Amino acid sequence: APADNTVNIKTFDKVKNAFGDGLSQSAEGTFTFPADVTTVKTIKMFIKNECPNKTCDEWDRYANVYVKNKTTGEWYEIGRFITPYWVGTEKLPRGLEIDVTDFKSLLSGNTELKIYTETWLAKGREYSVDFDIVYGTPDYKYSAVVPVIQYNKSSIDGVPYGKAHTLGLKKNIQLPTNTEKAYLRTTISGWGHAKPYDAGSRGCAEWCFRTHTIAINNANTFQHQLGALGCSANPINNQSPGNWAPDRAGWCPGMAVPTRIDVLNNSLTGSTFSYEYKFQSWTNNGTNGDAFYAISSFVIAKSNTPISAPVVTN
Ligand SMILES: CC(=O)N[C@@H]1[C@@H](O)[C@H](O[C@@H]2O[C@H](CO)[C@@H](O)[C@H](O)[C@H]2NC(C)=O)[C@@H](CO)O[C@@H]1O
């Protein structure tokens, strides 16, 4: 049979995210992706950060990429990473890799993308992003994705962690009746060294290890352990003198923030069910700054027959 092909799509080419008068922390652009995605098996996004000769904002910054929903105009976070300290991603020839297959329905035709870095220096960060589309035979011909929650405009725009009440994490999701497979895609990272510290002088939410929970129809169904990823083993090991090696809770400097995939029960199909993201209980005493969990959680619906995006309500 004709060999299944892989197409590479180049979009951002050495774009700069920076902070300054005539500068911008984000860069957006429209790129042409093939129109038909019915045979797309995988899409890999590669982010190359060019930071030669300490020419960039040397801090380990929060950064992310979005695809625009052509009809609603809403930006969906397709990938998130923390810039390495001092250097770029040169240690990785193709750059940081994040699977964005879940968004194949949005990556068709002239598609608008946005890349942001929470950079506060004019030096900023420079990137080049390309995508590999691998065609073959996906088990499901059609897919639809919609965000359940997105508190991710920046690290400090994440959900405040440790306050008396934490609202905005509960929604209702309505899956199409023709849904054959459904699952959640979640990306969460913590900011801050808020007190009280955990043993080991670990403040929240950057350093304190936590396991969060997703409850479906009130039943605790999935668990998200934000533990040690093994930052010392990071291939981008040229980050010193920055504090790159110790483990943060669920992330590392110079590494993509992990994508958590939770497969929903087929009994949920053709139903509206409750979704609730619950952070592990903690109370900020407010003596050492804030704590925030930048989070985006999407629900993907797949079927061999055309499927509309699931409906999310409060
Ligand atoms: C990924 C991560 O958590 N990075 C931290 C940065 O966010 C910190 O930078 C500080 O970020 C806040 C919020 O954007 C700014 O208000 C603050 O000015 C900025 N501070 C500096 C010195 O750039 C950073 C420093 O605390 O620590 C990590 O890099």
Nominal resolution (angstroms): 2.0
The letter for the amino acid at 302 is K
Question: Ligand 1, from 17, 56, 61, 239: best to mutate by most atoms within 8 Å of Cβ?
Answer: 61
| H-helix or E-strand spanning residue 125 | strand 125-135
Ligand 1 centroid to 94 CA: how many Å?
27
Q: Is the CB of 82 under 6 A from ligand 1?
A: yes
Domain shared by 48 and 173, yes or no:
no
Tokens 């890799």 correspond to: 97
The last residue of one of the domains, among 113, 139, 165, is 139
Please give the Cα distance from 58 to 65 (Å, whole number): 20
Ligand 1 centroid to 220 CA: how many Å?
33
Domain shared by 107 and 144, yes or no:
no
Domain CATH code at residue 254: 2.60.120.230
Task: Return the bridge partners of 260, or none.
Answer: 186
Q: Is the CB of 206 under 6 A from ligand 1?
A: yes
Domain shared by 208 and 262, yes or no:
yes
b/e sequence 170-197, b meaning 16+ C-beta within 10 Å: ebebbbbebbbbbebbbbbbbbbbbbee
Catalytic residues: 60, 118, 206
The last residue of one of the domains, among 85, 119, 139, is 139
Please give the Cα distance from 75 to 65 (Å, whole number): 9
Please give the Cα distance from 266 to 270 (Å, whole number): 9
Task: Give yes or no for a contact between 115 and 12, defined as CB atoms under 8 angstroms apart.
Answer: yes
Domain shared by 207 and 125, yes or no:
no
Which residues contact residue 189 at a Cβ distance below 8 angstroms, ignoring those fewer than 6 apart? 62, 80, 82, 155, 158, 250, 251, 257, 293, 294, 295
Domain shared by 125 and 9, yes or no:
yes
Domain shared by 56 and 133, yes or no:
yes
Region of residue 86 (phi > 0: left; psi between -120 and 50: alpha; otherwise: beta): left
Ligand 1, atom nearest to 57 Cα: 23
b/e sequence 17-34, b meaning 16+ C-beta within 10 Å: bbbeeeeebbbeeebebe
Ligand 1 centroid to 132 CA: how many Å?
32
Gyration radius from the chain CA atoms: 20
Number of domains composing the chain: 2
Q: Is the CB of 86 under 6 A from ligand 1?
A: no
Task: Take atom 3 of ligand 1 and give the residue whose Cα is closest.
Answer: 191
Domain shared by 130 and 192, yes or no:
no
Ligand 1 centroid to 294 CA: how many Å?
14
Ligand 1, atom nearest to 85 Cα: 29
Domain shared by 186 and 39, yes or no:
no
Domain shared by 37 and 173, yes or no:
no
Q: Is the CB of 290 under 6 A from ligand 1?
A: no
Shortest CA distance to 257 belongs to which of 46, 57, 62, 58?
62
Please give the Cα distance from 70 to 50 (Å, whole number): 30
Question: Which approach determined this entry?
Answer: X-ray
Q: Is the CB of 239 under 6 A from ligand 1?
A: no
Domain shared by 157 and 135, yes or no:
no
Question: Ligand 1, from 83, 155, 204, 229: best to mutate by most atoms within 8 Å of Cβ?
Answer: 155
Domain shared by 232 and 202, yes or no:
yes
Please give the Cα distance from 175 to 220 (Å, whole number): 19
DSSP symbols for 98-115: EE-GGGTTTSSEEEEEEE
Ligand 1, atom nearest to 192 Cα: 3
Domain shared by 117 and 160, yes or no:
no
Entry field: residues in the chain: 314
Ligand 1, atom nearest to 191 Cα: 3
Ligand 1 centroid to 76 CA: how many Å?
23
DSSP symbols for 226-291: E----GGG-S----TTS--SSPPSS--TTEEPPPEEEEPPGGGTTSEEEEEEEPPP----SSS---
Q: Which domain holds residue 187?
A: 140-314
The last residue of one of the domains, among 121, 139, 157, is 139
Question: Ligand 1, from 17, 19, 59, 292: best to mutate by most atoms within 8 Å of Cβ?
Answer: 59
Tokens 């940081």 correspond to: 96
CA 214 to chain centre: 17
